[PDB]
Amino acid sequence: TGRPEWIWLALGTALMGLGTLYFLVKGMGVSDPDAKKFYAITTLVPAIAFTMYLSMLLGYGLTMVPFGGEQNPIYWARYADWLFTTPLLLLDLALLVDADQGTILALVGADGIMIGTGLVGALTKVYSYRFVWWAISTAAMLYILYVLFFGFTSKAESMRPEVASTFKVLRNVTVVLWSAYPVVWLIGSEGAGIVPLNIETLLFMVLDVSAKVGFGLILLRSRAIFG
Amino acid sequence: TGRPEWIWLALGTALMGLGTLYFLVKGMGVSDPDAKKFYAITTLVPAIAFTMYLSMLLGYGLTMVPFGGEQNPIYWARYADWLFTTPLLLLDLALLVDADQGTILALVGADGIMIGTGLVGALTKVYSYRFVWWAISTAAMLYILYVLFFGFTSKAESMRPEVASTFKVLRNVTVVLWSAYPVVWLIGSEGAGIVPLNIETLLFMVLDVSAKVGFGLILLRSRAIFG
Amino acid sequence: TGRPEWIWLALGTALMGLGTLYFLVKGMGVSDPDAKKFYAITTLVPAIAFTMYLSMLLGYGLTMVPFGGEQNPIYWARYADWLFTTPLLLLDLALLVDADQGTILALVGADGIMIGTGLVGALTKVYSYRFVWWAISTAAMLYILYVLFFGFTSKAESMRPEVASTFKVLRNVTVVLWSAYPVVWLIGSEGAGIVPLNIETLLFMVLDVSAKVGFGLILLRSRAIFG
Numbered sequence A, B, C: 001t002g003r004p005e006w007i008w009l010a011l012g013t014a015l016m017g018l019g020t021l022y023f024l025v026k027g028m029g030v031s032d033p034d035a036k037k038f039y040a041i042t043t044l045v046p047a048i049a050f051t052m053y054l055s056m057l058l059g060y061g062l063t064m065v066p067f068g069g070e071q072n073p074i075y076w077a078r079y080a081d082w083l084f085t086t087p088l089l090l091l092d093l094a095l096l097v098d099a100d101q102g103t104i105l106a107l108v109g110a111d112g113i114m115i116g117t118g119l120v121g122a123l124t125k126v127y128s129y130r131f132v133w134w135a136i137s138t139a140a141m142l143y144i145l146y147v148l149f150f151g152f153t154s155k156a157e158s159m160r161p162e163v164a165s166t167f168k169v170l171r172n173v174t175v176v177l178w179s180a181y182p183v184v185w186l187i188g189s190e191g192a193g194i195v196p197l198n199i200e201t202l203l204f205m206v207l208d209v210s211a212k213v214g215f216g217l218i219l220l221r222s223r224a225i226f227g
């Protein structure tokens, strides 16, 4: 159920909150329209994460789902978060590399399917089916990481060194971090309950904060965001 | 509960409906692609408002939420409306002033959070928490009004007199009207039930019709929408 | 109820699935950014259709709605599908014809209302009201078909013969196919239950597969998608 993980939810709420304030209080005197975009995108990521983490701490983002033969605690707020949040992160990567509109649309589409499909899995009552959705969701993710690693890097090679190197760091951080989510999900309370909801919430928190605040920090503190 | 406010819901449905028909039957012979955008955006605002007002009149947009120690009548359709509707209005303002993509994204993002956060508050069962969400939602709104008043006006000063003056009127109308919503919400059935759902529905109706049909009228009947 | 139509749901799932794989394994070596857009848009249509068809086969996309004086089986997954799917198809048509942003926004808006309004109708408990929503939804559709037939054709006349002719075929296929949906809905389980859910699911399947895979095939196998 949901009570002992309250501390990781409170800390996540706090970290996303402070992360938003910091990015806000840093893009204030920015005149460059390109940099402006990066700050707007990057600042909204933790801001959204803040509201959803708060809904989980306060209990609104938690529901109960029966499967296997029990009532399981499912924090559905994560999907609401990730639905807008993961595409924004992808958008940062795309602008940095100047991706084609077509690929940006393919990426956002793949991402929406990944999260939507992951949400359906989390709320499915037939235990066995949850894993089918997990598989579809993971296939979507793999497609996204493939394009960022192989497709985007190539695109980054045509920009100036500052941009190419910052993209490289951001690229490595998201590929590694993003692939941990399906694993956490599979072994957590949403799948084979090997790991307790307590530790699971701590894992997602570290992952979320790293994939947003950290990512944001690496990006917003480089000159890559400038023309 | 919901029954005696049926008249304000029926009138709102009617006014949004006639408002859509009028804007539609006015943008028919418009060749200017810029003006076309304004008509498309502005016409969809009342059209959406029409469908949601109708759902409330017919009872579908009403739900019951327990909090304090009672079953409260919450018209959730408003948020569904405002979720697409408020950003469209912001988009009209942005095109008129030729805002940067970055700021447009920040505004739409702030707006989505404002409505989403306001929806969560309206459906929260812990009476005390509803106000936390209200606070977050209001902070988001204040951020939006700040940019429209101080940021956009500056941008409008670089356009021709017709555009600058129409923007000024639209700006004053939305800043004043938008700030009334959180007050109505706070004192209405969603917050401290000082005002009866009856009078509350009448307030939102006047506010909604003014902020859409009125706004649309001020905009679509000026030459500001032309290049 | 839902059980005997499982075969049409399984076949639809299969066809959308194979349809996605085929389009994916065809746009692989495409360098043209314009063609790229078409492949991205067109491939995502069946991909989304796949996930929603699967949710219906597995039972998640089915709910029960009381109206008339009974518990009716309503596959709500269709709307989730169509909400993103119909606009994407419209986007293909718009790019092919190089439509104005204003009209694209009017079309997407009309489309969202059509599906949203159709969803509300499908879930409404007052039998009589369901048809009011159906009427509003159909009016929205008629507005869309009008613009595609009369507005877009004109726009297509200014492109080269390959584009104009492919647009013509796509135009005829969507106008005819799209208008069948409201009829199926009206006579199916969502409206006057003249046709059994069994036959209804078979009708939507043929319509869906034709309006996506077929449409995609006609488009992706022509040179129209190139500059």
Ligand SMILES: CC(C)CCC[C@@H](C)CCC[C@@H](C)CCC[C@@H](C)CCOC[C@@H](CO[C@@H]1O[C@H](CO)[C@@H](O)[C@H](O)[C@H]1O[C@H]1O[C@H](CO[C@@H]2O[C@H](CO)[C@H](O)[C@H](O)[C@H]2O)[C@@H](O)[C@H](O)[C@@H]1O)OCC[C@H](C)CCC[C@H](C)CCC[C@H](C)CCCC(C)C
Residues within 6 Å of the ligand: A044, A048, A051, A059, A060, A061, A062, A063, A064, A076, A079, A080, A081, A083, A084, A087, A088, A119, B063, B064, B065, B083, B084, B108, B109, B112, B113, B115, B116, B117, B119, B120, B123
């Ligand atoms: C403009 C865009 C293009 C915007 C579009 C936004 C929208 C489409 C996003 C949807 C996102 C999806 C992914 C999340 C939905 C998940 C869905 C499956 C879960 C839905 O459930 C929650 C929903 C409704 O809450 C409820 O109200 C109903 C009506 O009154 C009730 O009938 C429900 O029961 C009620 O559910 C709540 O309460 C349940 C309680 O049960 C009880 O448990 C307690 C425990 O102590 C006790 O046991 C009781 O006895 C028992 O009864 C609980 O179980 C439920 O979980 C739930 O709390 O909520 C709506 C949420 C809203 C949509 C969140 C918004 C998210 C944020 C703010 C979005 C910011 C987005 C902007 C748009 C991004 C901008 C950037 C872009 C430009 C890129």
Ligand SMILES: CC(C)CCC[C@@H](C)CCC[C@@H](C)CCC[C@@H](C)CCOC[C@@H](CO[C@@H]1O[C@H](CO)[C@@H](O)[C@H](O)[C@H]1O[C@H]1O[C@H](CO[C@@H]2O[C@H](CO)[C@H](O)[C@H](O)[C@H]2O)[C@@H](O)[C@H](O)[C@@H]1O)OCC[C@H](C)CCC[C@H](C)CCC[C@H](C)CCCC(C)C
Residues within 6 Å of the ligand: B044, B048, B051, B059, B060, B061, B062, B063, B064, B076, B079, B080, B081, B083, B084, B087, B088, B119, C063, C064, C065, C083, C084, C108, C109, C112, C113, C115, C116, C117, C119, C120, C123
């Ligand atoms: C393409 C885009 C990018 C589009 C995305 C669109 C989508 C994400 C928008 C979401 C918007 C959000 C903000 C609204 C959701 C609020 C949410 C919390 C509330 C959800 O509840 C309603 C929902 C489901 O209805 C229900 O069906 C279920 C399944 O069958 C049932 O299990 C539920 O119970 C049922 O709920 C209804 O009935 C309840 C009844 O209870 C009873 O009360 C009676 C009273 O007499 C009596 O007491 C009975 O005994 C008792 O049981 C009732 O309480 C509930 O409130 C409810 O009526 O509804 C889905 C709504 C749908 C999403 C509305 C669409 C809005 C319009 C048409 C959108 C137009 C948008 C276009 C996209 C804009 C284009 C412009 C852009 C380009 C900028």
Ligand SMILES: CC(C)CCC[C@@H](C)CCC[C@@H](C)CCC[C@@H](C)CCOC[C@@H](CO[C@@H]1O[C@H](CO)[C@@H](O)[C@H](O)[C@H]1O[C@H]1O[C@H](CO[C@@H]2O[C@H](CO)[C@H](O)[C@H](O)[C@H]2O)[C@@H](O)[C@H](O)[C@@H]1O)OCC[C@H](C)CCC[C@H](C)CCC[C@H](C)CCCC(C)C
Residues within 6 Å of the ligand: A063, A064, A065, A083, A084, A108, A109, A112, A113, A115, A116, A117, A119, A120, A123, C044, C048, C051, C059, C060, C061, C062, C063, C064, C076, C079, C080, C081, C083, C084, C087, C088, C119
């Ligand atoms: C980024 C974007 C801009 C993205 C936005 C996405 C979002 C807003 C889309 C919303 C789309 C709308 C149109 C669909 C919503 C319809 C809505 C009215 C119906 C909602 O109900 C389902 C919902 C929740 O499921 C449930 O969880 C709750 C919490 O735990 C429970 O309280 C509910 O009860 C539960 O409902 C399920 O179970 C019910 C079971 O009852 C039982 O029946 C069995 C039968 O054997 C038995 O009798 C039992 O005893 C009895 O109790 C069942 O009746 C219900 O129907 C339901 O199964 O589900 C959330 C779905 C999720 C949103 C689907 C996502 C769709 C796909 C993957 C989208 C891909 C999109 C990308 C974004 C497109 C990209 C392209 C663009 C760029 C153009």
Ligand SMILES: CC(C)CCC[C@@H](C)CCC[C@@H](C)CCC[C@@H](C)CCOC[C@@H](COP(=O)([O-])OC[C@H](O)COP(=O)([O-])O)OCC[C@H](C)CCC[C@H](C)CCC[C@H](C)CCCC(C)C
Residues within 6 Å of the ligand: A016, A017, A018, A020, A021, A024, A025, A027, A028, A030, A031, A032, A033, A036, A039, A040, A041, A043, A044, A047, A048, A050, A051, B100, B102, B103, B105, B106, B109, B110, B113, B136, B139, B140, B143, B146, B147, B151
């Ligand atoms: C604990 C918290 C996490 C909880 C908070 C609740 C929160 C969920 C609600 C708040 C909404 C929030 C999510 C909104 C996100 C905004 C974010 C995306 C913004 C990123 O930033 C994008 C920029 C766009 O810039 P511009 O306006 O276009 O400026 C043009 C300039 O004039 C040069 O033009 P030139 O090129 O021609 O030379 O935002 C506009 C730049 C402006 C010019 C400057 C604006 C300054 C701000 C108003 C002040 C900064 C905030 C404060 C330090 C405190 C924040 C409090 C909070 C409650 C709002």
Ligand SMILES: CC(C)CCC[C@@H](C)CCC[C@@H](C)CCC[C@@H](C)CCOC[C@@H](COP(=O)([O-])OC[C@H](O)COP(=O)([O-])O)OCC[C@H](C)CCC[C@H](C)CCC[C@H](C)CCCC(C)C
Residues within 6 Å of the ligand: B016, B017, B018, B020, B021, B024, B025, B027, B028, B030, B031, B032, B033, B036, B039, B040, B041, B043, B044, B047, B048, B050, B051, C100, C102, C103, C105, C106, C109, C110, C113, C136, C139, C140, C143, C146, C147, C151
């Ligand atoms: C009671 C009611 C509230 C209930 C109604 C239900 C409602 C919810 C469903 C309807 C959907 C509705 C919401 C859709 C909104 C549409 C709105 C946003 C449109 C705004 O308008 C945008 C324009 C885009 O213009 P274009 O097509 O691109 O024209 C280009 C021209 O050829 C010049 O080109 P050049 O530059 O090269 O010289 O719409 C296209 C312009 C067209 C060329 C002209 C179209 C005319 C219309 C078809 C007729 C107008 C409507 C009728 C008077 C009656 C309406 C009935 C209703 C049921 C539809």
Ligand SMILES: CC(C)CCC[C@@H](C)CCC[C@@H](C)CCC[C@@H](C)CCOC[C@@H](COP(=O)([O-])OC[C@H](O)COP(=O)([O-])O)OCC[C@H](C)CCC[C@H](C)CCC[C@H](C)CCCC(C)C
Residues within 6 Å of the ligand: A100, A102, A103, A105, A106, A109, A110, A113, A136, A139, A140, A143, A146, A147, A151, C016, C017, C018, C020, C021, C024, C025, C027, C028, C030, C031, C032, C033, C036, C039, C040, C041, C043, C044, C047, C048, C050, C051
């Ligand atoms: C049974 C199934 C239905 C179930 C599947 C589950 C599914 C729901 C989840 C998968 C997500 C899926 C929906 C995603 C849709 C993607 C689709 C929209 C893509 C359409 O395609 C758009 C392109 C964008 O192209 P680019 O990257 O920008 O290439 C630029 C080039 O370098 C030239 O540049 P120049 O102009 O300068 O010269 O996608 C990128 C092009 C790449 C360069 C090439 C990519 C190749 C692919 C990685 C391999 C193709 C797929 C495989 C055959 C098998 C698919 C398995 C599935 C599980 C993913």
Ligand SMILES: *C/C=C(C)/C=C/C=C(C)/C=C/C1=C(C)CCCC1(C)C
Residues within 6 Å of the ligand: A049, A082, A085, A086, A089, A114, A115, A118, A119, A134, A135, A137, A138, A139, A141, A178, A179, A181, A182, A185, A208, A211, A212
């Ligand atoms: C700020 C949040 C971030 C960066 C979240 C990333 C999330 C993912 C990559 C989630 C992926 C999932 C799967 C591949 C399968 C199972 C379910 C999910 C949704 C956890």
Ligand SMILES: *C/C=C(C)/C=C/C=C(C)/C=C/C1=C(C)CCCC1(C)C
Residues within 6 Å of the ligand: B049, B082, B085, B086, B089, B114, B115, B118, B119, B134, B135, B137, B138, B139, B141, B178, B179, B181, B182, B185, B208, B211, B212
């Ligand atoms: C057509 C509708 C319009 C212009 C609606 C505007 C709505 C707002 C500015 C709503 C703001 C709210 C808050 C700031 C806090 C509490 C809840 C809301 C959603 C009523």
Ligand SMILES: *C/C=C(C)/C=C/C=C(C)/C=C/C1=C(C)CCCC1(C)C
Residues within 6 Å of the ligand: C049, C082, C085, C086, C089, C114, C115, C118, C119, C134, C135, C137, C138, C139, C141, C178, C179, C181, C182, C185, C208, C211, C212
């Ligand atoms: C891939 C799916 C396609 C092309 C779906 C098209 C759907 C429509 C044109 C649906 C229209 C409807 C109405 C006009 C009224 C009643 C309800 C609907 C949603 C079935």
